[PDB]
Design a protein around this ligand. Structure first.
Ligand SMILES: CCCCCCCCCCCCCC(=O)SCCNC(=O)CCNC(=O)[C@H](O)C(C)(C)COP(=O)(O)OP(=O)(O)OC[C@H]1O[C@@H](n2cnc3c(N)ncnc32)[C@H](O)[C@@H]1OP(=O)(O)O
Ligand SMILES: CN1CCC(N(C)c2nc(N(C)CCC#N)c3sccc3n2)CC1
Ligand SMILES: CN1CCC(N(C)c2nc(N(C)CCC#N)c3sccc3n2)CC1
Ligand SMILES: [Mg+2]
Length: 411
């Protein structure tokens, strides 16, 4: 059933995943010296290419590949159109490794055919709370705690094969080469997400959506008008009214995050993320990188009253190409990123996210039910979508956890 994934150090079934008590590696210990120095073999008509994702023109070449060939829905109505500025942000965080950005080109004429990208993350990925209690009940604490320390691992994203090269087994070769390049830097685990079900997720969450421009969402068929609204004289007017928002934020002291906020936003975020079983650890440099405002890419606001920052939220932008329509070419989506509330309820903080995103011309706000995102779904009028996001590890046994015990946002 999985000619590639059955060869890899990942749990092969749910049954297997059910026997997993403790976090730890799946493969035997190996060293950098054990890993092939030479690139993985590839057909003589292709070549490996390492783009420089801080050079405008190489970011542009990867941007076109993804614009034309990255994830689309099954009805081929929407395809992600991550921007060039977003891709430099996402793939060049502090201490990134250029060699973990891996592309395939056709040698003759240099057509770009495939891509995959790794970036560093420091991740808490030790045994989860409910399995540390089982370990205590059995006298097994020391082996449950072995990998408690945050680990410096690889986060994988942006795997893409050009549509003309699909179903030719190119994705496994690009995954093997990325694994080799990561293992040559003495890193042996990765985390990744996907919509598709592969062997074998450690957590899965549904997507949720909050309409901000319901008339446009209906016009492009992201949304339909729900059947009850047909009982009204003007179903669309009622739908618009349902989802209307204030025109300015309600929290006193909301303002954009500045460099001087980085230590306090790091402290409140890290204290909050500590509470989840799987989550990132960020340095001040990574808080700066991932959360300071960047035009068209990431939007972050703090609540400061009387000189103290007590709360913050962030969202990022991923537009999609609207493939069929005549009135619109683009879907402008805001995604809930990290946040922390210490002075107000989470729903009150996230209402201001929706207000600012709507003011800035976003059409929808999306999120997965990770973090404490379930706590504001109903009041803020999010609905579940049909998608999901599955969380995976490479070379790491891990017990199944609920998505409300995951604190890693994947872009
Ligand atoms: C220590 C360091 C480790 C670093 C590496 C960690 C692992 C990272 C793993 C990557 C994490 C990526 C995270 C993201 O970016 S998720 C986003 C993935 N990208 C897209 O969906 C874009 C649109 N689609 C495509 O570009 C292609 O359809 C792709 C490239 C996805 C597959 O190309 P193609 O359709 O031409 O197929 P093939 O003939 O080459 O290959 C077929 C094999 O590929 C397995 N497959 C299909 N889809 C995925 C998928 N999303 N993750 C992992 N494996 C996938 C499939 O089960 C089969 O294996 P098996 O069933 O036969 O066994
Ligand atoms: C009515 N629904 C069907 C379409 C779903 N939706 C908008 C959606 N959008 C997608 N794209 C690319 C636009 C995402 C946004 N916003 C994709 S990609 C794979 C599945 C998928 N589904 C949302 C629920
Ligand atoms: C690694 N990536 C994490 C985020 C994913 N993403 C932005 C995303 N994915 C979605 N899905 C269902 C997972 C797609 C993949 N892979 C959807 S559904 C509707 C909005 C939406 N946005 C795209 C893949
Ligand atoms: Mg292929």
């Amino acid at each position: 059933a999985h000619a590639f994934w059955s060869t890899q150090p990942v749990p092969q079934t749910e049954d297997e995943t059910e026997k997993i008590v403790f976090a730890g590696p799946m493969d035997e210990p190996k060293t950098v010296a054990d890993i092939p120095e030479e690139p993985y073999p590839i057909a003589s008509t292709f070549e490996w290419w390492t783009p420089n994702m801080e050079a405008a023109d190489d970011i542009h070449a990867i941007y076109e590949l993804l614009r034309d060939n990255y994830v689309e829905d099954d009805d081929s109505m929407f395809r992600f159109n991550y921007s060039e500025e977003f891709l430099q942000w996402a793939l060049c965080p502090p201490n990134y490794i250029p060699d973990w950005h891996v592309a395939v080109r056709r040698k003759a004429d240099k057509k770009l055919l495939a891509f995959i990208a790794g970036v560093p993350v420091t991740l808490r990925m030790g045994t989860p709370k409910y399995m540390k209690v089982k370990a205590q009940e059995k006298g097994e604490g020391e082996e449950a705690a072995k990998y408690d320390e945050p680990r410096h691992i690889c986060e994988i994203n942006f795997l893409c094969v050009h549509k003309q090269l699909r179903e030719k087994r190119l994705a496994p070769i690009l995954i093997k080469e990325a694994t080799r390049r990561v293992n040559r830097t003495n890193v042996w685990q990765a985390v990744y997400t996907a919509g598709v079900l592969l062997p074998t997720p450690y957590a899965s969450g549904q997507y949720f959506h909050r309409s901000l421009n319901p008339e446009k969402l209906v016009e492009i068929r992201f949304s339909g008008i729900p059947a009850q609204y047909q009982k009204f004289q003007n179903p669309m007017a009622m739908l618009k009214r349902n989802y209307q928002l204030p025109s300015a934020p309600k929290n006193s002291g909301l303002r954009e995050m500045k460099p001087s906020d980085v230590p306090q936003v790091r402290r409140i975020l890290m204290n909050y993320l500590d509470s989840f079983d799987v989550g990132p650890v960020f340095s001040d440099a990574e808080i700066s990188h991932y959360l300071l405002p960047r035009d068209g890419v990431v939007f972050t606001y703090v609540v400061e009253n009387d000189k103290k920052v007590t709360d913050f939220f962030s969202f990022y932008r991923i537009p999609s190409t609207v493939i069929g329509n005549s009135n619109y070419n683009l879907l402008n989506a805001a995604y809930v990123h990290y946040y922390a509330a210490t002075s107000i309820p989470l729903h009150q903080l996230i209402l201001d996210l929706l207000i600012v995103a709507h003011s800035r011309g976003f059409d929808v706000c999306n999120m997965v039910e990770i973090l404490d995102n379930r706590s504001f779904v109903e009041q803020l009028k999010f609905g579940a979508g049909d998608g999901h996001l599955r969380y995976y590890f490479y070379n790491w046994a891990y017990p199944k956890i609920k998505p409300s015990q995951v604190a890693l946002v994947m872009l």
